[PDB]
């Protein structure tokens, strides 16, 4: 019952390519590099 | 002898431990199964935890050596020293008991 | 006086050898080696440079099989 | 079926067939086989898939039943 | 092969001293298949059935053996480990060949299990196909291609080519050794080749195989590795060449046509109850009763016919120091090539599986050392009385039979 | 080396060429554009401060000051620029001018030391090449194009003309220098061991050579005009001479300029005149000793796994031409897979020559693929099989000589010997069987010792 599963799986996997189009990977990075913490001891 | 316990003891290559034909290496004072060409220690015990040995008479055609040890955990060691076994076999098994 | 020109080739000791079995198997002159120094320079006849280039094809499939 | 790993291919040469020789051959061998169950002999079936048994009739179907 | 409940065959390829005959069992009980073990040999027989005791109670219940003279329950029971079909004389079987062909197609169809098809020709697998009605086959084979064949493919017959694991992580985990491939090129001894170029018959193939440069590197390579007491046996192909190599320097040796009950002995000192370290082995004793298993092989003759059966013996014999290798090398292999005897004709073909293995190729042609060491043939004058021996050696011998 | 180690470093190329020159086009040699490139082109702190130091000095100072100024623990230094002070020939060791050894430098090149770094005067800015006050207002790009035709054509005559029909005589002039080799069977010529290196780093030293190479005649050809002339380049781009040079020119100066036109450094417009503009390839020869450029991703990749070493493919219209000028390597039938049964066609190319250092710079260093990306060495263990292919060259020797045999006494062989390794005639002697070679050329010599003693 594992290539009922594995087939499947990488139809999926394969196209990779759908996931950049979206800013995912690139809002967060503008949005993490912003946090300046402040706490002068 | 000057009473220190010298002379290393005759060290054995390739030593089968259940389907594992690793190496036994016998230092001064403590035993070592080298797993092969290796640095660390795999089997770390020494001249001590040791309670007694089992070998093979002359009429089994294999040799085991048995070590027992004090919680129940015996572990055999077929050798297979294809150089000279006949006459290590009980090397081993001397030098472990003429020298403490 | 007395000289002897010929072509000097330097070769390996074990390879000098190869060259003397061609000497008694070729019929085209008289002989091939006209002279030995020692086992890693043989001599030649500077006429026969032309001929030995067709020894090639023969010489050089064994020579890549080492 | 071949013609689901043909796309597959096309995508990967970005903006690009391949050629076009071995596409007209993906047709050649399918899936099937036979399966023994209650029977007690064979069973005919195969897989999910549909182009697997649309080239069959035409050879044992239509000599015997 | 089965992940599916589906068939799929085709030929897997599993590393040769891990296991081969493990995985066959392991895979029939998923299976839920009454198989049926078609062995290659008379070594096949013990193994197989190994894996039936401490694994599951087929061996002392639906166990059955047709080879090795055995014939335990011929009706009652499916599972049985033969030999392909090697048990059907002419005449001189009769009645026993048919009662093994006929009481097989009634009670017995499931997997045709196959080892080692690599070399068997495509006559003996008409004859499997024919006495068995088996709907299912299976391969278990490491290597690629069969009898190194590019044009012709005559695996369709008892299933293709399905899929190949990664060596680099076989080998980088504790299934295989570290085998440390190098080529030793020594050069041709002069006094021999001068009779090779000279004759037209089969009497020259002994000539660059006794080469006196090789033999002083072959002792140089035991004693290379006699310091280091590892498990060393030097193959070669020829019958009567490897004898000569182990009386000049006083080590047992074994061959073909010597004695079973000699043998018996002689296989358990090695491995059961040794006592001997240097002994010669060819292609007989390694698959008919106890695989050998050693560490370093020296291979002399590289030309012979069987050009494909030291593919797999390479995995058999070099087995790791442990069992369970963790990121280091240790197993060395050279191999012992002649120059200028057109022998790099199979010497190239071998780059090609090497580099499929994950194995560490190199060439090195001078030893840098062989002649500051104690060696034989030293002089030119004991050269010269080897080409007396040689050349009076009869090729009739060979076993005695008419 | 057979032929490169000067132009790799370029204060020692000009130090050696310079000490074969003539009296009369040395002295016009030190000028003030000269300066600048005497001092620069050098790399060791030692050797460039001296040249201050006889700028304010007016009298000539002896070897006491020299062997003071190293104060105690600098004197191993001073061994490594004595033998520099000669290359360049412009100092002079008087016999003692106000001490012992006074050691002073040529007045007439410290007039003009002075004129490019102090003072000044009018005849610097009114001749041209050296200045030519003039702006750049044409199209760049559109004239980098033709820098790399110039030298497309050259590799033309490399491999024997494939589709180049010019009349440049770039064949003959690349053959001194040990880099083309003239065919014997045919006409066209090939390249020698030297030249698979060259087309490897792709650097613009070796175009300084070429410029240089007409003046070794010593014929009718100066020095002076050469080095001010060589200058207009060297200063990258936006420096012109509009029509300045056409006022100024003689039938000299027109020889060198067509010649430089088509190495490679310099751009001229139609009709060989007008407005010249220099190309940009000669911005990195006053850069450094070397350089790289010409792509931006690299899609080349070799492979380190077996050993018939696969080489890149698919780049541009220059490794097409160049890997089968190396040693003709194959194709098969997708977009040029070069390099994949390779095993008979490298010994085609080594039978020629011991080309083996050039193979192994091309396989490690071709657009710089491995050593970015993976991190082991990049060849795996071929190393020692090409040392294996170019001993197969040294199994047999095609050369003449003459053989004395027959002698008398062991003392006489050897005094003998003695006589052709003085000349120069000798190759091998065995003085356990009393046997010489002795070269033909050489042969009418070696009789008449033998006939005296």
Redesign the interface.
Known sequence: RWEGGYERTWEIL?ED?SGSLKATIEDILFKAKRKRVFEHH | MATSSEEVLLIVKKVRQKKQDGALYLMAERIAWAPEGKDRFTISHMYADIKCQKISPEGKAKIQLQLVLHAGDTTNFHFSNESTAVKERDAVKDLLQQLL | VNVLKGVLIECDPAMKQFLLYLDESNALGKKFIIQDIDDTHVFVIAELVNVLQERVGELMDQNAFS | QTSDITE?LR?LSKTGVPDGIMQFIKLCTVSY??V?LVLKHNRYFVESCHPDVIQHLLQDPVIRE | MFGNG??RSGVIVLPCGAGKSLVGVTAACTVRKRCLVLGNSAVSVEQWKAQFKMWSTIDDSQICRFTSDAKDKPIGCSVAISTYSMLGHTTKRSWEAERVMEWLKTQEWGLMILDEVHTIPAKMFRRVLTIVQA?CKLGLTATLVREDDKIVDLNFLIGPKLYEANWMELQNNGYIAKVQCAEVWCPMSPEFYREYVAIKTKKRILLYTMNPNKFRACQFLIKFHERRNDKIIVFADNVFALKEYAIRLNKPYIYGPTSQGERMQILQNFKHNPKINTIFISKVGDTSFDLPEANVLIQISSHGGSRRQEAQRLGRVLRAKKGMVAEEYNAFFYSLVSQDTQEMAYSTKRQRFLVDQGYSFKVITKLAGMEEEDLAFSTKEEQQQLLQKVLAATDLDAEEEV | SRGLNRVHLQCRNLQEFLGGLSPGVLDRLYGHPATCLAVFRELPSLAKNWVMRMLFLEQPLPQAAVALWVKKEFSKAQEESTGLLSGLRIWHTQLLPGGLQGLILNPIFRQNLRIALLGGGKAWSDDTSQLGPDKHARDVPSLDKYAEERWEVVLHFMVGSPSAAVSQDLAQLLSQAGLMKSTEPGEPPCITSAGFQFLLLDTPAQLWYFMLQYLQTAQSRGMDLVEILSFLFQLSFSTLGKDYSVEGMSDSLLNFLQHLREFGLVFQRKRKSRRYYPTRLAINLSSGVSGAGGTVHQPGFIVVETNYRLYAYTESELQIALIALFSEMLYRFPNMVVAQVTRESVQQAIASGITAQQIIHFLRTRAHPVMLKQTPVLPPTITDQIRLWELERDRLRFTEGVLYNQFLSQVDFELLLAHARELGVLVFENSAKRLMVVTPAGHSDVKRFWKRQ
Do not use: D, I, Q, V
Request: hydrophobic letters at 10%; aromatic letters at 10%.
């Open positions: 394969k390519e | 597959y995508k086989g036979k023994k | 589906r068939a709907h």
